[PDB]
Every structure is written in structure tokens, then in C-alpha cells.
DNA sequence: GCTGCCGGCGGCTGGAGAATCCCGGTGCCGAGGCCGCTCAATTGGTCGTAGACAGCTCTAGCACCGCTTAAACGCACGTACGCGCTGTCCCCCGCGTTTAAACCGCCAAGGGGATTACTCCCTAGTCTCCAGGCACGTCTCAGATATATACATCCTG
DNA sequence: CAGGATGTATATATCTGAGACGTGCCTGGAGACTAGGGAGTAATCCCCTTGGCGGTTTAAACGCGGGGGACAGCGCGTACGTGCGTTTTAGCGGTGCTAGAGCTGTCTACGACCAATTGAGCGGCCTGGGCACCGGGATTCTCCAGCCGCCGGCAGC
């Protein structure tokens, strides 16, 4: 019987790359990120509250920063005659970016 | 499986789709945890200034003004939330 | 006698008195000139008109009669000089410009 | 119910009616434009005041902002903006 | 004519009170002057910006303190706010 | 009578009156509080003293009794807590630290 | 021959030895015969950004002489502030 | 018969030696002429201060020292010791002057 | 020789998920009239930054020759580049399914925010004193050599 | 596989010499002593919007299985960057030698300052109608996948 239909490895990845690049939706879920930000901000001020607008703005700024960092990481990865992004790649991209050292 | 760290709320599919929006087609297996670490580092860096701004206001809330001001101070301005 | 707004005599739809007050109370200088707010209103008007036209063109491209922040991001990032001006700016609900590295593409 | 806030909504709408007369603008886009124009205004005014302090002057005239925009905006926007400022100030002075 | 202005003698006194047997060159001296001026301008701008955000027309020690907290990283910020606080209490004790 | 300076009253070696005048004339706010110049002088004094003991330690290591910008860079770029503040600024006649990548080193 | 001394072909004056020493300070072990032009290009691009701002400062000052104030001042504007020139 | 250092021994000696120095890297009149030549394009009939020229030279020197640091790091990441144009291009792309 | 045979070669149509597009009505809410309030224009007078004019002088721009120093060419070579072979094994892509995101609704309430009287912390003016910049002025202690060896490097037996 | 000879560096004794460190001098800035006047501060109170609660409901994340292609080590052709020797070419430099315009002082004036009215621009506050959205469904759009004539060896004879 016919082998079940399968895309080749590395094509649906490009399809969803195209899908996400044209979409402005929030790639990170509301509740896990809000929980993370509260769990990481409780140390600065115990029992601190946030506004909904403030938390969505913070989340979207984090997404923009991380997506730019990832695009620079991919640029460095393709520069190093490879396609797989490696930990050394992300560290190098951060360290050129001037945020690490 | 109900007691978990809130940093792990940033799940593998979510970071994978963030990278896909970035424009990378292949990701290695040791990217997720270190990207989580750098993401949390950026979070503490921005929220430190945000909470400092809030304490200046003599208020217990963190309105969008403090977070946009903190982001602008860090070097990443943001539009649409007041200004 | 009869009064008239300074924006009408300045040929700009942007306010003049408002920018004058903003300069006055903004703690920039001890004094500001009379033509300084007019100049600032003019340059702000030009900037808004340019960015609005660039966003509306993308809106008509996406067959929308209303400007969405995604259109603003597309207009900002598409224009190279505007991208250089707003380089370290994060937009609300804008996403990123669609670009894929050609190396990642298949052979054919 | 009180403390009427202040914003550039009507001015951006009026500019739109003269660039794309049959085009609407979303509320989020309106907030983005208001924040952007406020940021650009703050940057330009800060540059103008900073230069005024630099050359030991205590007044901000059209020349200070002219040098600021020539200093801030690169490319064609600089020349177009200085031309717009010059024509606006000449028009204002002509009919005072 | 036209007396100029510099932070020379103050850094001089600081180094003499922490290093009785060490001198400073003229070019490094102007480097110290630029360091002091740049940090002073940074703190003053941050304080003015904070006061404008909080609808405040005055700058007290509190805005300076918060700028020190948010601008320098960690240990320097905490040490600097400690010294600033003790200095301001000492000054307010006999004004 | 009996005029005394604010720097002595605050136990500081930086001019409190001068810092207050600079704040007054710098167009930062319509008014300035009394303790703000004291706090500013204190923090500048701490920072200067901090980099100064680093520079003195570097000079004593380099067996010299004079402070030069080479010592200033050698002291600033060794501790990362000061680097995070002065990582963007460069100083005249500075140079860099003697760092060589391990791969560039020979086999043994 | 009083004024108007137009100069050309001066970017080449940075010799290959010179870039070699600069990169040795940067800490490289080897080099290629291909950087010597792009490093010159990044040089020219950097200087046009600096002195463009410097001459705008000078023109605002209603003067022709470009003091070190203007250059360090534009340098601080570009986010690359310099210490040791009266800043 | 003759004594020759290995291809890199003198290179390493230069790295470990010249890094400890702090003087200006490159001859002065070259930058002086170059700065005048570029400033001529923006506006003619200029007048430079010596301190301004020293500041420009030191700023450019530091900029390219940092740049060569970044390209050396990129090259050592690319499993190589030499440096190539793509290293400089990548470093300037991530830094953001060209983006 | 002149037949069989044997594997690749890529060219094509064909089976097959996904992406796109039009209708269709349903929501949702940018766009538009009203009121007054809050601020902006407007006369009416002031006074003080910033332009001009008259110089002064420190500083900016030049060429010149000894000279040496580093720049420049070319030279052999052993290395590091770039790449082919190969061989994991580690990411990928579906699949079932477990789970937590969200959205829904309704509260409870700590707190954000608009008014109030004032006070007291700051500002504005005069007079008074002095800390600090500047012009010198040194005597240094800071540099700068040529010298004598360690050293580690590239080989040899 | 262990030492020897060598271009590198290391101390280091005088020379030797620009410049940190005082030191008067004076002066504009700092500071002390009064009106005085609103900016912020508790006090007050009124929404409000943020935390918290618990059903659906459902897309989504997680563990797992198969496999395929990306990556990294090994080996090799090569080209070329480097150390080095031999020129040679421009920089260093102390020197007058020249003027250029920043710079300071002074007179002036005009443009911003601020005040007391006065009226409208617009922020708000509804409000009906016009535009974005969702679902079904038809339409393309690529993606991958095997069939087979053509092509090139592959063994005999």
C-alpha cells in the first residue's frame, strides 16, 4: 500500500517561516509569560501588580528582541558554513551585539 | 505535573516559532535552555528599571508608562502604548 | 478684535500654540523663539505626512481602507532611509519584514 | 469623566485627509503615530536645547531646530524638512 | 581673562586622600574631567526626565537616588546610593 | 557671618554649590532640591575614588607612580562591573588588554 | 597657488603594514589580501558620519574653525563618546 | 642553513608585543590629509584644530581595533585563523551601522 | 567481434496536502454631531539676550632639509584554505493524547486618581568673603637610552 | 626523543628633560541673611481595574517512532600569507614665516515675557451606520514520487 504522505525534512519549516513572517500575532502565550514575569519580578518588590497593557507591551518587546537576536543568530550560522544554529552561534551573536560583554 | 517553574512556561514550540519568525529553518537541541536563560536575563534587565520607575511613582502598580520608559532607557523604544 | 489660530496663518494643519506650550513647559530652554514652534510643527507635519502616505500605499496593497500598525511597520522597514531613522524602534503589532536567507532554500 | 488628556489624534487625521482622503486609520495605528510623533518631537527639541546650551545661547529659534533636523534626519527627509520649515516660517511671517 | 572651569582639584584631592604617593598625568587628568562631566550630565538628564514623567517641577535627592539605582549596575549602584544617603543625612544634620 | 561651603558641611570633596548651579542653569527643572547636589557630589566622588584605586593598583603593578590613560584602561577593562558602565566609552590613548585566543597559540 | 588645494587618492595612504599592525592590536594571527579595501571603506564611511555632524555643528556655531569640541561632540552623538578631549 | 622563524612565530610575537602598547597606530599626516580631503566634500574652506584631528584619529583607531576584534572572533568561530571580507561584513551587519 | 544485460538519468505526469479566494452574513466601533471648558490669541507695555561694530591676538596653514624609518617588492615555502569521502546520530516530521491557554462570567478590593489648605522648602535680591583658575616657576622624579645577560626556538645527533 | 646556537626579551647605569606640584593674585562665584510664594504633601473620597474564583473547550505541547541529511573528522590539492632580504619613499621634525578668524567688550534694539480679557478647538460623549471577520467551499500551488525510453558501460565472443 502507498507510503503515507510526508513532506521532505526542511520544507514545512519554510512554509511556517512564511506563515509567521506575515503574521503580527503574539507568538508567546499570555498566561505562561505573565506567570514568568510575575515570578521574576516578585523579588524586586514583593506582591507587585502589573497592568494588562504593561504586560503585553513587555511581552511584545521581549518577542521583538528575541526574534531579532534569532535572525542575527541565523545570519551567523549561515556565515559559518552551516544551517543549524548552535550554542556557540548564539553566544557569538550576543557578544557582537554588545549585550553580553 | 502541576508544580513547574514559570521560566519553563516558555515552551519549545513557542521558542521554535519565534525562531521561525526570525528566519531560521533548522535548530539544534541545545538552543532552547540557553535561549531561555538569555530571555530571562533580558526580562530581569528591563523589569529592574520598570520597578524602579514604579517605586519613584510611589505606586504599587506597573502601568505601561514605566515599561515603555524602561525599554527606551535600555535602548529599545516602543510605540503604541501611550508615548 | 477677531482672533484666528496661528496654524491658519502658518499654513500648517498641525498646531502652533500647542507646540509653543510644549516647548515652554518641556524644560528645554529658558526661552524659545516665535518661529521655532512653527518650524517644529512644519517638520512634524512633513514626517507624519510621509509616513502616513507610505503606510496607506501598503494598506491599498493589502486591500484595506484602514491603516493597521502592520502597515506602519511595513512602510517603516521597507524604506531604507526611514528604516535607518527608526532603527532602534520596536513597533506595536507590526511583525517583521518577510525575508528568507537564500542559502536555506532548496536546490531548485 | 475629567482631566481631558491631550493627543495628536485630530492633527494626524487632518493630515491623512490631505494625503489619502478616502483612507481610515485604526485606533492602534493612531496610538502608534501619536507616540512616534511625540518621540520625534522630544528628540528634536532635546537636540535643539542641547545645541542652545552648547553654543551658550538661552533661546530656541528656528535656526536651532533647523540645525537639529539637519542633524537628526538623514537622506532626503533632511532637505525636505528644512524646506518645509523655511516655507512655513516665511508664510507665518508674511501674514502676522 | 574668561576664567575657565574644570574638576581638576577635586579629583586631585580624591587621589591624594586615597593615594598619598601617586600622581596623575595631564591627559589622564582631562580624561577624569570628561568622565565626571559625562556621568554628571547622564544623572542630571535622567533626573530631569524622571521629574517630567512624574509631573514634578523639582529635583530632590530621591530622583538622583533612583537614577543611581537604575543607571549603574549592581554593586556600584548600591555603594553609590549608600554614600549619597549618608552624605545627605550628614548635610541635613547641620544645614 | 561665618560663611562655610556646602561641600564641607556634607563632608565631601566635590563642589556642592557648583553642582547645584550647574543643575540650576542646565534646564533640567524649574526648581532644584537642596539635597540633590549633595547626592550628586557624593556619587561622583564615589565613582572617581573607585576608578582611582583601580588606576593606582594598576600603576603600582606596573611599578610607576604616575597615572596615565593606559593605566585607566587597564583598570577599567579588567572589572566587568565598571565595564558595564564604561563599555560604550573609549578614552584617549587607551589601547586594549593583552588577550590572545587559545587557538592562535602554538601547539605547546 | 594661494588656496583651493583639492586632494585625491588619499585613502590608499593607509599601507598594508598599517592594517597588519592594526589587526595585530586587534589580535589576529593571519590576514588576507582582501580586507585592505573594505577596511578603508569602513574608514571612509565612519569619517563621513563624523565630520558631517561636525561641520553641521560648526555651521550652527556661525564659525569656520572646527574645534575638538565639535568632533568629540558628534562622536558622543553617534553613541561612541570619547574621553580626553575636553568632554 | 639560515635561521627562519616558523610561519606565525613572529606573528605571535607581534600580537603579544604590540597589544601592550598604547600609542597611535598609523602615521599622522595620512589621517590629516584624509580628513581634510573628506571634509572638503561636505563643505569647502574649513579650518581644523589639531586636537580635533587627534580625536578623529584616536576614534577611528579604536573603532577598527574593536572591528578587528569582532572579525577575529568570527573567523575563529568559522574554524579558521585567517580573516576574510565576510567576517567584516557580518560584524558590521550585527553591529547595526549598515542595517 | 556484435549480442545479451545491467544500472543510471532525468523527464514527465500524477497523486496529495496546504495555501488562496469569493460569498455571506454578523459582529464591532472608526467616524461624526454637541457642549462647554481650557486654553490659545490679543492687545499693551518691558527689558534683556543676541546681533552689529571695533578691534587683539592666539592660533591655523606651509615649505624645507637631514635622516631614518618604515614602506614596498619579490621570494620559498609550509601552512591553512577549501573541498571530497564517509559515517553517525541527531534533529525533522507526523501521531496520539494529555493539558494547560483562554474566554467566559462575576465579584472584592487595594489602589489610581481628582480636590483641598497649607507650609515650608525653594526662589529672588544684596552684601559679603574666599576657593579656585591662571601665570609662573621650578626642580624634579619620571622618562630614555645604550649597555650586560635569560630565553625559548628551531633544529641537530 | 634530549641538548646547542641563536634572534628575541629581560635588568640597568647614567643622561636628561618636559611637567606634576606648589604659589601668589585676584575675582567672579559661593554663601549668609531676608520677603514671599506657590509645589508638593497629607487628608479625602470616588470609581476602577486588577487580582482572584471556577466550567468549558479546545488548540496545543509532549513523549515517541522512523529516517535522512547535516555535521564533523580524515585526507589531500593548492595558493598564498609570512618571514626575510633588499631597496626607496614618504614621514618626522625643528625651523621660521605668514595671515585668519575666534574672541572679548560695548551699544543697541527687538523679540520674547508676561498680564487681563475673550472666544473657540477640541476632548468628551453618545450614536447609526459602515467596515473587518468567520465559514464553507471552490481554486490554485507546490511537493514528492514512481515509470520508462534514452544513455552509458559490461561481460562474453
Residue numbers in the entry:
A (entry chain I): 35 to 135
B (entry chain J): 20 to 102
C (entry chain R), F (entry chain K): 12 to 119
D (entry chain S): 27 to 122
E (entry chain M): 28 to 122
G (entry chain Q): 16 to 102
H (entry chain O): 37 to 135
Tell me what the authors wrote about this structure, in their words.
Polycomb repressive complex 2 (PRC2) trimethylates histone H3 on K27 (H3K27me3) leading to gene silencing that is essential for embryonic development and maintenance of cell identity. The interaction of PRC2 with substrate nucleosomes involves mainly two structural elements within the catalytic subunit EZH2, the bridge helix and the CXC domain. A central mechanism of PRC2 activation is the recognition of PRC2-trimethylated lysine peptides by its EED subunit, resulting in conformational changes within PRC2 that lead to the allosteric activation of the complex. We discovered that H3K4me3-containing and H3K36me3-containing nucleosomes inhibit PRC2 using two distinct mechanisms because of the differences in their positions along the histone H3 tail.
To investigate the molecular basis for the inhibition of PRC2 by chromatin marked with H3K36me3, we sought to determine structures of PRC2 bound to modified nucleosome substrates using a PRC2 complex containing AEBP2 and a construct of JARID2 that included the allosterically activating K116me3 segment (referred to as PRC2AJ1–450). Analysis of the cryo-EM data of PRC2AJ1–450 bound to the H3K36me3-modified nucleosome resolved two distinct states at 3.1-Å and 3.5-Å resolution, respectively. In the first state, the H3 tail can be seen binding to EZH2 and entering the EZH2 active site (referred to as ‘tail-engaged’), while, in the second state, density for the H3 tail appears absent (referred to as ‘tail-disengaged’). Further comparison of the tail-engaged and tail-disengaged PRC2AJ1–450–H3K36me3 states revealed that the tail-disengaged complex is rotated with respect to the nucleosome interface by approximately 12°. Of notice, in the tail-engaged state, R504 interacts with the backbone of K36 in the histone H3 tail and R497 forms an electrostatic interaction with the backbone of the nucleosomal DNA. In addition, the CXC domain in the tail-disengaged state now contacts the major groove of the nucleosome DNA at superhelical location (SHL) 6.5 (while it contacts SHL 7 in the tail-engaged state). On the other hand, when the histone H3 tail is bound, as captured in the tail-engaged state, the H3K36me3 modification does not affect the binding of JARID2 to the EED regulatory site and the allosteric communication between the EED and EZH2 core subunits is not disrupted. Our structural data show that the trimethylation of H3K36 interferes with these interactions, resulting in the loss of a well-defined register for PRC2–nucleosome interactions that is required for effective H3 tail engagement and methylation. In summary, our results are consistent with a mechanism in which the histone H3K36me3 modification reduces productive engagement of the histone H3 tail with PRC2 and promotes dynamic interactions with chromatin that are incompatible with the trimethylation of histone H3K27 by PRC2 at actively transcribed gene bodies rich in this modification.
